[PDB]
PDB file of N, CA and C in Angstrom:
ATOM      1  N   UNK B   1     113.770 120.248  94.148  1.00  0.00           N
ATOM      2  CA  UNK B   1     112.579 119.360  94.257  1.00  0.00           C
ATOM      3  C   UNK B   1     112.975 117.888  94.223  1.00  0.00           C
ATOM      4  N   UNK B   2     113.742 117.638  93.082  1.00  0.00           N
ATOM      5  CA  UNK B   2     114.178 115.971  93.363  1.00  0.00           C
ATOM      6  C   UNK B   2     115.115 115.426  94.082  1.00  0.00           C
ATOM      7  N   UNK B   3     115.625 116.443  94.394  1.00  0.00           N
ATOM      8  CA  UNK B   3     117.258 115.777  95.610  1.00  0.00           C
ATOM      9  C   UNK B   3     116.462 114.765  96.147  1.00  0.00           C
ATOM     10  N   UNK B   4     115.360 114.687  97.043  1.00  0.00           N
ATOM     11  CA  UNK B   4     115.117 114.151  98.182  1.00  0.00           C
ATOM     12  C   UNK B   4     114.344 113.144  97.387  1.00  0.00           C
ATOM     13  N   UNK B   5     112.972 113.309  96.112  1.00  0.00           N
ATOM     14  CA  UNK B   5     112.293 113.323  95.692  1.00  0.00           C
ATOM     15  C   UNK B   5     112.853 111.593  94.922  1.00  0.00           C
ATOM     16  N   UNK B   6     113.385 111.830  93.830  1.00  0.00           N
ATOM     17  CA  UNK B   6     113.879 110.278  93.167  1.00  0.00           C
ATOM     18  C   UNK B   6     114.694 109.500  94.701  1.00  0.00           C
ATOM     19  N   UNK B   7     115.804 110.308  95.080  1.00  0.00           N
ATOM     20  CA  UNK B   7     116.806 109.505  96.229  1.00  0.00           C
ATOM     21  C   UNK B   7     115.913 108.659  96.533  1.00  0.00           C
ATOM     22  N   UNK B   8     115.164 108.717  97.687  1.00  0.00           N
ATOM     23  CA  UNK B   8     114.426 107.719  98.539  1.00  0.00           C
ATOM     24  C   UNK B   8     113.932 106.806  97.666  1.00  0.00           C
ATOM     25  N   UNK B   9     113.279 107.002  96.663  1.00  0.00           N
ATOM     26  CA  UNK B   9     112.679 105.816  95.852  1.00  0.00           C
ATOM     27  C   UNK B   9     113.441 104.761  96.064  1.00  0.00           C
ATOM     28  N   UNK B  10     114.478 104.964  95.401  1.00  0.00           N
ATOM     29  CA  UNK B  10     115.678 104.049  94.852  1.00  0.00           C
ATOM     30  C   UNK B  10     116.260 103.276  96.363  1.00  0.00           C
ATOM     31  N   UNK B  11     116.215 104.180  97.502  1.00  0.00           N
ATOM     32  CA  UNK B  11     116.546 103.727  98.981  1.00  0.00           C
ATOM     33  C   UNK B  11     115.902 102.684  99.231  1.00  0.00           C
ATOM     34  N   UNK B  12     115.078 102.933  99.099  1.00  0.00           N
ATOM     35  CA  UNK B  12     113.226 101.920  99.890  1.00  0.00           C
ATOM     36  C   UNK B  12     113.395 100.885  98.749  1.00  0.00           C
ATOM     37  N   UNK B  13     112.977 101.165  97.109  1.00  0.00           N
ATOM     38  CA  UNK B  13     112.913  99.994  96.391  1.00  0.00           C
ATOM     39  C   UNK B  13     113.846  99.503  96.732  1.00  0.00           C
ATOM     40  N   UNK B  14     115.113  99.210  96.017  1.00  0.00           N
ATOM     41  CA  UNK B  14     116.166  98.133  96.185  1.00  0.00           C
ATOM     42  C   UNK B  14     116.133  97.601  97.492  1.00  0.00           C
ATOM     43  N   UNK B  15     116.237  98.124  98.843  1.00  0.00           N
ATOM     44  CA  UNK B  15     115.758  97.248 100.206  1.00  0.00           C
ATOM     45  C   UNK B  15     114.767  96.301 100.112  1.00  0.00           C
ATOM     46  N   UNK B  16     113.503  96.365  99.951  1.00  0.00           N
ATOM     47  CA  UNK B  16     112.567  95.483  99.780  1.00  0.00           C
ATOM     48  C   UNK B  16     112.971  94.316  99.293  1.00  0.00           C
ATOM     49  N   UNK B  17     113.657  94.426  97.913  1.00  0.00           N
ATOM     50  CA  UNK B  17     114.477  93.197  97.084  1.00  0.00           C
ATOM     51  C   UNK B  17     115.211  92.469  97.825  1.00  0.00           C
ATOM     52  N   UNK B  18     116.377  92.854  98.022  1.00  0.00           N
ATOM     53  CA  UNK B  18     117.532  92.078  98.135  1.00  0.00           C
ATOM     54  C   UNK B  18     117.085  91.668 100.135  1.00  0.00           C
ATOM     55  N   UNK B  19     116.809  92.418 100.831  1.00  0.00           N
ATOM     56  CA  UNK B  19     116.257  91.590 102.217  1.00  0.00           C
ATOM     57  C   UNK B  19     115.700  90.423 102.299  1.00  0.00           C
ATOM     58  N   UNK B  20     114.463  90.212 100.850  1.00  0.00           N
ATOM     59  CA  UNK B  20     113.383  88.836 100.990  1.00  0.00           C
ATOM     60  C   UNK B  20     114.258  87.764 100.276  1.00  0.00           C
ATOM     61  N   UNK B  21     115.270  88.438  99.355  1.00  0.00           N
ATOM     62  CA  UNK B  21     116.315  87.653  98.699  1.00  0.00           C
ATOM     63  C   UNK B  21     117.072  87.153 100.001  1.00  0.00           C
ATOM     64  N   UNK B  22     117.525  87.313 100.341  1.00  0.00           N
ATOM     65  CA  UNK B  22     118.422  87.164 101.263  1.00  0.00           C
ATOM     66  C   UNK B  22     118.016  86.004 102.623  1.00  0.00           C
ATOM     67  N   UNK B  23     116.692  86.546 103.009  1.00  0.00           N
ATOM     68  CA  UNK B  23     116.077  85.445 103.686  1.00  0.00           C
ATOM     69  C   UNK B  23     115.935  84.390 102.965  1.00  0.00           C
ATOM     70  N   UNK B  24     115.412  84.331 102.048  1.00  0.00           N
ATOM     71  CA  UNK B  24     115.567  82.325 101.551  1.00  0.00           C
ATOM     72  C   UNK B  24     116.669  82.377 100.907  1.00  0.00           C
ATOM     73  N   UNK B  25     117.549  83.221 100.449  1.00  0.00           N
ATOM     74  CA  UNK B  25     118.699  82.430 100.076  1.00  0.00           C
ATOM     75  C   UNK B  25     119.514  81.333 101.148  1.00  0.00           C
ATOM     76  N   UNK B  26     119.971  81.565 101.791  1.00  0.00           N
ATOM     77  CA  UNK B  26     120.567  80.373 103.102  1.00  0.00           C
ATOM     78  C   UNK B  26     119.794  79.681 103.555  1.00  0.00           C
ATOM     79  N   UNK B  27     118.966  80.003 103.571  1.00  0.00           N
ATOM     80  CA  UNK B  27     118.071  78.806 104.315  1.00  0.00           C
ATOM     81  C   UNK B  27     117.808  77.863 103.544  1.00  0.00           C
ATOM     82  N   UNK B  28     117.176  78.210 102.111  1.00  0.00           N
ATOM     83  CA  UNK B  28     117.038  76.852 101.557  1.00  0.00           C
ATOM     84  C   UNK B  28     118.840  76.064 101.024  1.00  0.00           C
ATOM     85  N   UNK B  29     119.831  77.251 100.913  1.00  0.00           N
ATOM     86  CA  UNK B  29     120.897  76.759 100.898  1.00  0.00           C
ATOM     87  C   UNK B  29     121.448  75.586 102.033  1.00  0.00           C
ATOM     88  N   UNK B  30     120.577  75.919 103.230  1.00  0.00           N
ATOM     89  CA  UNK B  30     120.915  75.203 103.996  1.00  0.00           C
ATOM     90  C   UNK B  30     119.851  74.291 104.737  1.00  0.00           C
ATOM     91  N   UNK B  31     121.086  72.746 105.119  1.00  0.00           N
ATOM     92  CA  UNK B  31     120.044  71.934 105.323  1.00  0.00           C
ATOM     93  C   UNK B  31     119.150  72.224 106.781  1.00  0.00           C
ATOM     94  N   UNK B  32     118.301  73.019 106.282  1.00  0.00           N
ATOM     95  CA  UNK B  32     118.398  73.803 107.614  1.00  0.00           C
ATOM     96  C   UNK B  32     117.918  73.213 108.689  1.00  0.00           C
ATOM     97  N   UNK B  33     117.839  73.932 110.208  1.00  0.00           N
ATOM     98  CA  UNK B  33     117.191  73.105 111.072  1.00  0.00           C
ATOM     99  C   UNK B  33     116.754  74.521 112.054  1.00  0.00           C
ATOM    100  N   UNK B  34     116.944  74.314 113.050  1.00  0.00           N
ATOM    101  CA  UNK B  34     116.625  75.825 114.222  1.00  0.00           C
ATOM    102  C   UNK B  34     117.427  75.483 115.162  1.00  0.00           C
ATOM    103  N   UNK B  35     118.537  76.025 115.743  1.00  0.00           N
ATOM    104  CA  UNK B  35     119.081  76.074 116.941  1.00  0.00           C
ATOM    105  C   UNK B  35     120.229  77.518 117.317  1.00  0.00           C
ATOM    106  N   UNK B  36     119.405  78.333 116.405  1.00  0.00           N
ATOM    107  CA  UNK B  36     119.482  79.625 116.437  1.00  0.00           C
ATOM    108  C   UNK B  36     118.175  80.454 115.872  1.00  0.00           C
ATOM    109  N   UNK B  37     118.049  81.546 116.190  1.00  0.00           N
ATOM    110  CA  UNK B  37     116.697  82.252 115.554  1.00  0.00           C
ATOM    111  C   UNK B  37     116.726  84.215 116.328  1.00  0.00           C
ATOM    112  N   UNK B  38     116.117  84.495 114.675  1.00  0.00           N
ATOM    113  CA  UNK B  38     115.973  85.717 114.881  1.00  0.00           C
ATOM    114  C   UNK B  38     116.129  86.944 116.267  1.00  0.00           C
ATOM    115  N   UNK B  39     117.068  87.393 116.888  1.00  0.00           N
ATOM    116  CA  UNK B  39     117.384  88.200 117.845  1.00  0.00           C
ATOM    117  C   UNK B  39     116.207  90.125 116.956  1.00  0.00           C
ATOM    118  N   UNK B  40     115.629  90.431 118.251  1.00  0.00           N
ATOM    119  CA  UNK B  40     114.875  91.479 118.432  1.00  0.00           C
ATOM    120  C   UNK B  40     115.546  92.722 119.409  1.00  0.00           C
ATOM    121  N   UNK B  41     115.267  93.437 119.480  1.00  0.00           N
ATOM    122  CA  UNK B  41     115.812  94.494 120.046  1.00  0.00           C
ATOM    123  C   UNK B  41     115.305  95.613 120.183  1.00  0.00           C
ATOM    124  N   UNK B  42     115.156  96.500 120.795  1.00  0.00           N
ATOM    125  CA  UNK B  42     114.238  97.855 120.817  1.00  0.00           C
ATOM    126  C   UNK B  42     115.477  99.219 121.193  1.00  0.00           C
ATOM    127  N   UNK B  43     114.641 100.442 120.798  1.00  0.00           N
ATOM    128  CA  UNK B  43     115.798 101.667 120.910  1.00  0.00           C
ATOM    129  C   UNK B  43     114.840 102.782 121.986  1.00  0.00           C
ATOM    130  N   UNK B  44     116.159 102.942 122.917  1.00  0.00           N
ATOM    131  CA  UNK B  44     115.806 103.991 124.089  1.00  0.00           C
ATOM    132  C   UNK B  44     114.631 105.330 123.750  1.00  0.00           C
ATOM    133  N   UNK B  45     114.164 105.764 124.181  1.00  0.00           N
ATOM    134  CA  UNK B  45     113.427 107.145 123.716  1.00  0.00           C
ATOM    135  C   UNK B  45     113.691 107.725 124.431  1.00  0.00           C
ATOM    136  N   UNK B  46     113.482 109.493 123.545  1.00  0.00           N
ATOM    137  CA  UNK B  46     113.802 110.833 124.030  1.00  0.00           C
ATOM    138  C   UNK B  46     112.624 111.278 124.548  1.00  0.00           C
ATOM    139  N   UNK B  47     112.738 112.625 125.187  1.00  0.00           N
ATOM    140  CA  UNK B  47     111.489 113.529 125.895  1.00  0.00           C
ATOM    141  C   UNK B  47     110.883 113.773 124.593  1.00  0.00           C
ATOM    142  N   UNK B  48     109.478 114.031 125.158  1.00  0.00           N
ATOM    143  CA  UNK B  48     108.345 114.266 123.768  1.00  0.00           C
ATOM    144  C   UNK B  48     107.694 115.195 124.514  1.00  0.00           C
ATOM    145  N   UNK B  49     106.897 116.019 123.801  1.00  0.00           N
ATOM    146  CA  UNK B  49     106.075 116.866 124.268  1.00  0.00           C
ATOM    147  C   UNK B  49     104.374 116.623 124.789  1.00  0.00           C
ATOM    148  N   UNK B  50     104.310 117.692 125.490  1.00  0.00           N
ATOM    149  CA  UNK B  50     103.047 117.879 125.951  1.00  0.00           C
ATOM    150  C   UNK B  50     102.666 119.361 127.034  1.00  0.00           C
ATOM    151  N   UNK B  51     101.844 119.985 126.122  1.00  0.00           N
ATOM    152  CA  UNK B  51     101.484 121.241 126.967  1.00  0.00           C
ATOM    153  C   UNK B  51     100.603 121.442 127.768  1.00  0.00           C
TER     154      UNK B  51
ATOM    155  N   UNK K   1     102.318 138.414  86.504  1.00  0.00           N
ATOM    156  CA  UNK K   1     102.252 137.412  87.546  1.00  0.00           C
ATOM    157  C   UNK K   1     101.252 136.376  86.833  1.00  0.00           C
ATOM    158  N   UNK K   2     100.837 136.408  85.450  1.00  0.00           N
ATOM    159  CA  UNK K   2     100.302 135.551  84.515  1.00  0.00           C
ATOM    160  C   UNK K   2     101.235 133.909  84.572  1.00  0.00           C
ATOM    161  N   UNK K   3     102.565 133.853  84.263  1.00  0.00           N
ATOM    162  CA  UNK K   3     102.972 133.170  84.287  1.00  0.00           C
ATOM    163  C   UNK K   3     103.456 131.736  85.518  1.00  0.00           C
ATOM    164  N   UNK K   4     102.840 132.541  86.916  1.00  0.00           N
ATOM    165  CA  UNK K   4     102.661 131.688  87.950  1.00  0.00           C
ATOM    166  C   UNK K   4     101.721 130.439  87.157  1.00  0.00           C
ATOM    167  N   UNK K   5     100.425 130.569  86.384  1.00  0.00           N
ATOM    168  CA  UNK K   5     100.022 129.695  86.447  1.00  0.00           C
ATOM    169  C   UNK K   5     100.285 128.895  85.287  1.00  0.00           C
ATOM    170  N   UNK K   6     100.758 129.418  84.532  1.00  0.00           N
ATOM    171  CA  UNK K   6     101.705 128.967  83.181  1.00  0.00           C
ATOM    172  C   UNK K   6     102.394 127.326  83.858  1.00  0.00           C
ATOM    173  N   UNK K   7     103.147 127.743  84.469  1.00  0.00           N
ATOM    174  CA  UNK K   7     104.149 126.712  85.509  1.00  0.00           C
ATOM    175  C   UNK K   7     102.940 126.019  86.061  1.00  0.00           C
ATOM    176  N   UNK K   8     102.088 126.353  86.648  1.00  0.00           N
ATOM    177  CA  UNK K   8     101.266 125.628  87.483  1.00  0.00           C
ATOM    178  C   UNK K   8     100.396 124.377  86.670  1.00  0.00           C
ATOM    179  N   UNK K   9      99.772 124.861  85.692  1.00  0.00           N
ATOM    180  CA  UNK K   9      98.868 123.764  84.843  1.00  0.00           C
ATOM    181  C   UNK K   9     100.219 122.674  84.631  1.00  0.00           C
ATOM    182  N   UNK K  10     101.245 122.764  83.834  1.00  0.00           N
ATOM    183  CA  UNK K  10     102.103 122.126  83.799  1.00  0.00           C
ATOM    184  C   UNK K  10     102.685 121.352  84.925  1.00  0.00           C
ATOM    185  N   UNK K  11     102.566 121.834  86.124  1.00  0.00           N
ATOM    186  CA  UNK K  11     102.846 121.251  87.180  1.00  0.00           C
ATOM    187  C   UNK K  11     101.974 120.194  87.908  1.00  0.00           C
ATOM    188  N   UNK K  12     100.897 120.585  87.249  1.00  0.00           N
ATOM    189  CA  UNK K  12      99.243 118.785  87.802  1.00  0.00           C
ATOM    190  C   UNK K  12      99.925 117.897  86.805  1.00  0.00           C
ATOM    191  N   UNK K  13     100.182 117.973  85.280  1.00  0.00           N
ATOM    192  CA  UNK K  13     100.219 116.860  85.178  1.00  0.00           C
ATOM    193  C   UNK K  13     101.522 116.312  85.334  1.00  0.00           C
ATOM    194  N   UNK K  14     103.096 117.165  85.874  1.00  0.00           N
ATOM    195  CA  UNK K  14     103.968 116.958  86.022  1.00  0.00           C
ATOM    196  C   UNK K  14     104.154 116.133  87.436  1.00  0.00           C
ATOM    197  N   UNK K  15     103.644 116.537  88.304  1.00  0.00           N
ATOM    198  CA  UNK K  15     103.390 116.121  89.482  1.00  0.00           C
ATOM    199  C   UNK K  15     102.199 115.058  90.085  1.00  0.00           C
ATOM    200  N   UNK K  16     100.958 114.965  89.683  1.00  0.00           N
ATOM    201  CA  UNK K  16     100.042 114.501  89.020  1.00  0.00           C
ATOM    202  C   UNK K  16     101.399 112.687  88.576  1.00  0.00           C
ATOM    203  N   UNK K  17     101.950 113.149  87.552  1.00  0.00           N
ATOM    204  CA  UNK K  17     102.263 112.063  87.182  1.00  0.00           C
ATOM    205  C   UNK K  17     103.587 111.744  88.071  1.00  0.00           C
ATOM    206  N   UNK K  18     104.335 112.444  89.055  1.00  0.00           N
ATOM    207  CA  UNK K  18     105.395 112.229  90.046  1.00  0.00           C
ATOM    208  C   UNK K  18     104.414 110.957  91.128  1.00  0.00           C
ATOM    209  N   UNK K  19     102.884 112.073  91.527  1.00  0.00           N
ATOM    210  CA  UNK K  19     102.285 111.442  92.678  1.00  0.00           C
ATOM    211  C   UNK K  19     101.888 110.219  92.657  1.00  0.00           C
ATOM    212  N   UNK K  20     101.316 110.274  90.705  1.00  0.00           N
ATOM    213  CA  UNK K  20     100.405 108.569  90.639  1.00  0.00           C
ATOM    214  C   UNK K  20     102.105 107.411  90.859  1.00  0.00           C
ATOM    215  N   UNK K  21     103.409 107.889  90.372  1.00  0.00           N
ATOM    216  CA  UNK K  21     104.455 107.059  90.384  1.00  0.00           C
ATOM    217  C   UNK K  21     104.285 106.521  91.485  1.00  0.00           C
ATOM    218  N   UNK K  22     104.764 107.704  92.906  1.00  0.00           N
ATOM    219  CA  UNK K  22     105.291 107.065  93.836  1.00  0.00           C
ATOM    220  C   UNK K  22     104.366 106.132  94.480  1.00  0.00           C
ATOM    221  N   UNK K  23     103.215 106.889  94.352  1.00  0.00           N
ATOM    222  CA  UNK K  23     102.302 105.482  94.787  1.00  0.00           C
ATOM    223  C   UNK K  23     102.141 103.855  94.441  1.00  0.00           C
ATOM    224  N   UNK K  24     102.748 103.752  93.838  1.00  0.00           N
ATOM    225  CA  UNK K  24     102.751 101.907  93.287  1.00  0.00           C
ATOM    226  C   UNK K  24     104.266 101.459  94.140  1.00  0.00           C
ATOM    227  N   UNK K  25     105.426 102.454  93.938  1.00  0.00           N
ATOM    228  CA  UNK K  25     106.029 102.407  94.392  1.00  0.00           C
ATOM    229  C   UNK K  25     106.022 101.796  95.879  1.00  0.00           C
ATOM    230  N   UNK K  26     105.491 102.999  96.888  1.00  0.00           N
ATOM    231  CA  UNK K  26     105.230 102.685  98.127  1.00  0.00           C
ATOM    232  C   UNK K  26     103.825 101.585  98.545  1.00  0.00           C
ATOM    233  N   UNK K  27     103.212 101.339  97.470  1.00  0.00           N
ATOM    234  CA  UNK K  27     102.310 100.543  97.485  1.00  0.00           C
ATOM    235  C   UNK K  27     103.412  98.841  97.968  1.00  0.00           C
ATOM    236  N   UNK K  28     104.326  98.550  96.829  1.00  0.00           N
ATOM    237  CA  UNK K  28     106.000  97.508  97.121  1.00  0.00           C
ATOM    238  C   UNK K  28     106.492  98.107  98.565  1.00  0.00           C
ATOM    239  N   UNK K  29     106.610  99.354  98.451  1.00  0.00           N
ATOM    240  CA  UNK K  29     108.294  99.572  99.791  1.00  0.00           C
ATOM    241  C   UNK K  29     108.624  98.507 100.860  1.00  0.00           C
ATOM    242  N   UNK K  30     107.638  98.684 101.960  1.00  0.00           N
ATOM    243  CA  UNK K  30     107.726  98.405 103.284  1.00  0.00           C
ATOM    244  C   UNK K  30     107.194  96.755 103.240  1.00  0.00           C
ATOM    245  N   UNK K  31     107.610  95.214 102.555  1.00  0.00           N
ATOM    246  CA  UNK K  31     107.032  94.865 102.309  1.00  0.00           C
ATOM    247  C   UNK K  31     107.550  93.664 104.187  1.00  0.00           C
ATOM    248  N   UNK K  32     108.664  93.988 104.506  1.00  0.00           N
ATOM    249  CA  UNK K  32     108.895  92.990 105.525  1.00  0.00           C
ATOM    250  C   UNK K  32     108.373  93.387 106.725  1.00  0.00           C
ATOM    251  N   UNK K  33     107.679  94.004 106.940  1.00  0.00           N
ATOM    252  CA  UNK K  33     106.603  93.851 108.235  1.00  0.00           C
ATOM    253  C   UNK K  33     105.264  93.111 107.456  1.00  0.00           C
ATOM    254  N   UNK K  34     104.895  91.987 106.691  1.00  0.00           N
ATOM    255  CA  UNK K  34     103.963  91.408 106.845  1.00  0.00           C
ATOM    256  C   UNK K  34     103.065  91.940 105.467  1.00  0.00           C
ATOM    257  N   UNK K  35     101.937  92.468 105.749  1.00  0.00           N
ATOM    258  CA  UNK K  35     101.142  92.748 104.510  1.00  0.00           C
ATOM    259  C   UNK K  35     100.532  93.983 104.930  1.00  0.00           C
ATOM    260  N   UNK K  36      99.857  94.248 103.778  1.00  0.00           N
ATOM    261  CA  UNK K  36      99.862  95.796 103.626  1.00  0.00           C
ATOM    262  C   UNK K  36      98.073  95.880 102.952  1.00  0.00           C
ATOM    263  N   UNK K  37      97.245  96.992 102.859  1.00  0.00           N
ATOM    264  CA  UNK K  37      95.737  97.160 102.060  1.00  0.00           C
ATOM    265  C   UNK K  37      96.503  97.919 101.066  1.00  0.00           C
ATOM    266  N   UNK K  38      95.801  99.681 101.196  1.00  0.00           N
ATOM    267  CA  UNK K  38      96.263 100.517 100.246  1.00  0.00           C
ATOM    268  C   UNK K  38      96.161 101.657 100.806  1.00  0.00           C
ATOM    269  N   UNK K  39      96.324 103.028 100.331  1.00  0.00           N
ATOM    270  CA  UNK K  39      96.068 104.578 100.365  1.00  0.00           C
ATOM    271  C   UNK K  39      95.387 104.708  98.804  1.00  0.00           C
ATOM    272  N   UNK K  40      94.933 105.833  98.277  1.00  0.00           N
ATOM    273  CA  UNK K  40      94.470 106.526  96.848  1.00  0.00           C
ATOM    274  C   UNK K  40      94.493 107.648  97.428  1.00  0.00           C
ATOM    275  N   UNK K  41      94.352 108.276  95.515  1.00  0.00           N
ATOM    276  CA  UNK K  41      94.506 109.862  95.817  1.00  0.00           C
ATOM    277  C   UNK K  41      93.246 110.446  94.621  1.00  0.00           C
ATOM    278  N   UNK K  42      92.940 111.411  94.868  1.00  0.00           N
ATOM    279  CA  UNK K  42      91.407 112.061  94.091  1.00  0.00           C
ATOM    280  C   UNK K  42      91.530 113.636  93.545  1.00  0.00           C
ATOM    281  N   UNK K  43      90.680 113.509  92.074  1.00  0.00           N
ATOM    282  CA  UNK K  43      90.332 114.982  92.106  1.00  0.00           C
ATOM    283  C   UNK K  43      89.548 115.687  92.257  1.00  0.00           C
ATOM    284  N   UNK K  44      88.969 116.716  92.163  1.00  0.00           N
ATOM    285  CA  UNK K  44      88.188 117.248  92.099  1.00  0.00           C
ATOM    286  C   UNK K  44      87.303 118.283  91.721  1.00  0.00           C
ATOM    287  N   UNK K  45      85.848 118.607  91.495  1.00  0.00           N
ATOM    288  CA  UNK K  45      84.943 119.330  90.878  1.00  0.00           C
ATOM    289  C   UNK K  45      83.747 119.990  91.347  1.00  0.00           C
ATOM    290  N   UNK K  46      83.274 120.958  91.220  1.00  0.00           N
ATOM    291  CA  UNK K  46      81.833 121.217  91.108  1.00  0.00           C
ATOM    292  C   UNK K  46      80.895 121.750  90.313  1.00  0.00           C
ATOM    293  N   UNK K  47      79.970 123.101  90.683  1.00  0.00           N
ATOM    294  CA  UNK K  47      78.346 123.007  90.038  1.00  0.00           C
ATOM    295  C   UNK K  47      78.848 123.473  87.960  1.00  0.00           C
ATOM    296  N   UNK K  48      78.075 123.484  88.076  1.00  0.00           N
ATOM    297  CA  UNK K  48      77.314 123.513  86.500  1.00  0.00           C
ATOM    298  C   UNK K  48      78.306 124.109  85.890  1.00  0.00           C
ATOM    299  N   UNK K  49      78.746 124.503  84.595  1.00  0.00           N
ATOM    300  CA  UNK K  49      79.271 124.876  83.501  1.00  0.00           C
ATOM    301  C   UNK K  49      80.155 124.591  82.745  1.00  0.00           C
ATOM    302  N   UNK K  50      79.702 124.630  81.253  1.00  0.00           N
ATOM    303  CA  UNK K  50      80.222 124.457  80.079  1.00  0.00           C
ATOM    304  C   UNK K  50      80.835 124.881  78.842  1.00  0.00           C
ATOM    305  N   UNK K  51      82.232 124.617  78.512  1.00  0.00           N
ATOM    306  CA  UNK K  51      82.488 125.619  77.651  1.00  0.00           C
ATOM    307  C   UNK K  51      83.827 125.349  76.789  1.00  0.00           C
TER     308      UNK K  51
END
């Protein structure tokens, strides 16, 4: 029952943290400005159904 | 086959108290796509009797 059950908690919480950490850490570290910015990207898809 | 429910009462408030966890939990998780409302969860009852 808990293999899966605690794991993920602990997956998902700690991510949330340290990501929003991470975004203002450098930036306000830095004097910042913009002449770079966030790159996006998308992932191929497989066949899906329909009967 | 008495004891199925032996385990079982024990298991609402064992689980019961797993379900109310993860919910605050995942209420935090997913917080970098933006903002979030809520989900809840309910019990339930019906007609007449006392004892």
């Amino acid at each position: 029952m808990g293999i899966f059950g605690t794991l993920y908690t602990g997956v998902t919480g700690l991510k949330a943290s340290e990501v929003q950490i991470a975004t203002t850490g450098n930036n306000i570290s830095n004097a910042n400005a913009t002449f770079y910015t966030r790159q996006r990207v998308v992932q191929t898809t497989n066949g899906y159904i329909t009967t």
